[PDB]
């Protein structure tokens, strides 16, 4: 079929919300009517192209589904399906392919409503971004403000436990049940002794989470951070970033699976911030994926002043 953006016009475009916190499940929606201004055929299509600051999938990962996100059928004003839809993750583009519906009609009107999320990689810091959206080769301009809850959290003491994490990818479609999670260890970059980090696949009750953390279910990569001021607030973290120095190999014997659904990591005496990239799995119970990361340590000088800090995450499976 042929690209018919030049025959499709979108109108009364709306963004539901233009300020939100993607670290507390903030998101938005775009809505629009569209009308087909000329004869189009079944299999012809128009597109919507998202800007740097947005994604159509958010924290749902489609890398195990050909990197393509299924989208609910587009309806005509009369309630029937006018087009099949998919969202391409790489090009951040929705493709709406007209069905046989259009073969017998003129004056075709429809409408769509689509959730929108931050792009944690391209909008890694809190602030205001352009969010200009291209529908059927027309711009609909917007500004978006992300107030990311800060990943920099912990006990308010110069020697206190401090750590946070965020689940930034859950594969809900393929059946493989994978997830991606970024953990910042010591984001305050304090001087800490006998530091231990625990990555749990549950929070308080093990049977209330689909999380599955074990030596066969979980892979960890650990990075020493060079310049902490370049770390994201979105929790996005590129393992090939030169501001990170991988030290996974040096941890081959500092990682233990001593308890059910928990990875224990022996950081020891540290003076740096670390990034722990987690690749996990969750089970088939239908339960929410709840996680909890815990850091405990002492004062590196006196070995006293013990502190512990914990951080919860939760995404639906």
């Amino acid at each position: 079929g042929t690209n018919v953006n030049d025959k499709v016009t979108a109108s009364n475009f709306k963004l539901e919300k233009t300020t939100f916190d993607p670290n507390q499940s903030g998101n938005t929606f775009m809505a629009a009517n569209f009308t087909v201004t000329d004869k189009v055929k079944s299999g012809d299509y128009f597109t919507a192209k998202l800007p740097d600051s947005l994604t159509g999938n958010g924290d749902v990962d489609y890398s195990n589904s050909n990197n393509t996100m299924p989208i609910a059928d587009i309806k005509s004003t009369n309630g029937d399906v006018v087009a099949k839809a998919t969202y391409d993750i790489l090009t951040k583009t929705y493709t709406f392919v007209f069905t046989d519906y259009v073969n017998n009609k003129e004056n075709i009107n429809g409408q769509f409503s689509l959730p929108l999320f931050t792009d944690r990689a391209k909008a890694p810091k809190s602030g205001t971004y352009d969010a200009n959206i291209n529908i059927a080769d027309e711009m609909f301009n917007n500004k978006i403000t992300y107030n990311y809850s800060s990943p920099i959290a912990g006990i308010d003491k110069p020697n206190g436990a401090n750590i946070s994490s965020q689940i930034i990818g859950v594969d809900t479609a393929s059946g493989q049940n994978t997830y991606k999670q970024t953990v910042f260890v010591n984001p305050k970059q304090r001087v800490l002794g006998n530091t231990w980090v625990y990555i749990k696949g549950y929070q308080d009750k093990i049977e209330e989470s689909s999380g599955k953390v074990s030596a066969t279910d979980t892979k960890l990569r650990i990075f020493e951070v060079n310049d902490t001021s370049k770390l994201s607030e979105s929790y996005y973290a590129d393992p090939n970033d030169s501001n990170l120095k991988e030290v996974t190999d040096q941890f081959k014997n500092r990682i233990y699976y001593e308890h059910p659904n928990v990875a224990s990591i022996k950081f020891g005496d540290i003076t740096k911030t670390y990034v722990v990239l987690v690749e996990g799995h969750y089970d088939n119970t239908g339960k929410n994926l709840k996680t909890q990361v815990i850091q405990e340590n002492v004062d590196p000088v006196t070995n006293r002043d013990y502190s512990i800090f914990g951080w919860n995450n939760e995404n639906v499976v």
Binding site: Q24, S25, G58, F117, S164, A173, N313
Partner: peptide, 12 residues
């Protein structure tokens, strides 16, 4: 053991 952070995405 208990401050918090949450994500959001779409299932299409």
């Amino acid at each position: 053991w208990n401050s918090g952070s949450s994500g959001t995405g779409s299932t299409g």
